Amino acid sequence: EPFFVKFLKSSDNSKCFFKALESIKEFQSEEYLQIITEEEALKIKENDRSLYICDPFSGVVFDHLKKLGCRIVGPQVVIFCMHHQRCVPRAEHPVYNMVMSDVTISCTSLEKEKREEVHKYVQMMGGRVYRDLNVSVTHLIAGEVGSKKYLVAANLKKPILLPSWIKTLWEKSQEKKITRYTDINMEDFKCPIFLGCIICVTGLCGLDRKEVQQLTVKHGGQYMGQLKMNECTHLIVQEPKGQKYECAKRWNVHCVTTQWFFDSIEKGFCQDESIYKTEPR
Numbered sequence: 492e493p494f495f496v497k498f499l500k501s502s503d504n505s506k507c508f509f510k511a512l513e514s515i516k517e518f519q520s521e522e523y524l525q526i527i528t529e530e531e532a533l534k535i536k537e538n539d540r541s542l543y544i545c546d547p548f549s550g551v552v553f554d555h556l557k558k559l560g561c562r563i564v565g566p567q568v569v570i571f572c573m574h575h576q577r578c579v580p581r582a583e584h585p586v587y588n589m590v591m592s593d594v595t596i597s598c599t600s601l602e603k604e605k606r607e608e609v610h611k612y613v614q615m616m617g618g619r620v621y622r623d624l625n626v627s628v629t630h631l632i633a634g635e636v637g638s639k640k641y642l643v644a645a646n647l648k649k650p651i652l653l654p655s656w657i658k659t660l661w662e663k664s665q666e667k668k669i670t671r672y673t674d675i676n677m678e679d680f681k682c683p684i685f686l687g688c689i690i691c692v693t694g695l696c697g698l699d700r701k702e703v704q705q706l707t708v709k710h711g712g713q714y715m716g717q718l719k720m721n722e723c724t725h726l727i728v729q730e731p732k733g734q735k736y737e738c739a740k741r742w743n744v745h746c747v748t749t750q751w752f753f754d755s756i757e758k759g760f761c762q763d764e765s766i767y768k769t770e771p772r
Contacts, residue, residue: 494579496542497525499532505546507566514573532556542579544569548587548615557585568617571670584614590664591672592617597628597644600635600687601654609654612661616672624649632657635687636761645760656680683711684755689724691715693735695749703727703752710756718744727752731770746770 498512515524525541532543532552536559543563545553556563564579565587572579572589580586596613597620598606609632610620621628624643631644631651644651656677663669690707691714692700707714715723718735726739726746739746751767 492578493519493523494542495523495525495539496544497527497539499527499529499543499545499552501529501547501550501552503547505566507570508544508546511544511566511569514570518573535559535561542582545585548585553585571617580617586617587615588664589617590660590670594629594672595619595621595627596630596632596657597621597624597640598632598634599638599640599644600633602634605634605654609657612657616660616664633682633686636682636685637687641761642763645758650677651682651760652677652680653682684759684761685710685712687724688712688761689715689722690727690752691718691723691725691739692727693718693733694729695727699749703749706752706756725751725764726769728769736769740770 496515498508527543529552533555535556538560541562543556543561544566545556545563546566547553548563548565553563562582563585564582565585567588568579568586571592580589580592591613594613596609596618598609601609613620624631624640624647628644628649631641631649632654633641633644633651634654635641641651659675659680660669660672663675669675685707688707690703690712692703695703704714718726718739720742723739723742723744726736726744727749728736728739728746729748730736731740731746736746745764746769747764747767748769751762751764754767755762
């Protein structure tokens, strides 16, 4: 169980850094423990394959150690591992803490930029990233609804959460409020059933029209009174006929039956449009 470590001592550090120094001393002999001055650290030109520990993941020294490929982890990682009696992680990427330690996420319907931001957070918290979905994926970060991946996840009945969940976990992490992803409520971050949809309706009685209107707003979607191109995503129609229908069909907009809208709210996620196509043929 012993492992070779190097602590980096600066002036600013630290609250946890010193909890770590001690925690390790009670765990193993100093033979495995080295303490490095920022000067000493900068001289290193080779990856010892040792374990380096830095409290601030931003700094001239950090950048150097990271560029080399060294294994860097935050003090909170050591404390976490010591207390849970589980081995420290191998740091292909620097791991600041273990809040997200046993979780493996996936992403869909996110701006490439947003995706990368989430990945950096998940990685720095002891989590992994799995683009393709299989048994091992535990959570799906979704920016919107509709993709195949989104549908496969909903079928496997896996938690479909917003990027805010990750941002929250991270932010509540720096600030000493939380130590585990389970400490907050996933429920409050569920991806709205119609998030991303812009729904229009036709041929429904005023009562029904007003119902889908407020149910849409209640589930993250946007309601539009009229069908405008480059603005409407779904047009709820019962049958393949009418001037409005033919126009939506012309714009390549989804024409679906009410069955789609209400089954979505029933099942708890946005249904596949192919199953509810207004047009049979």
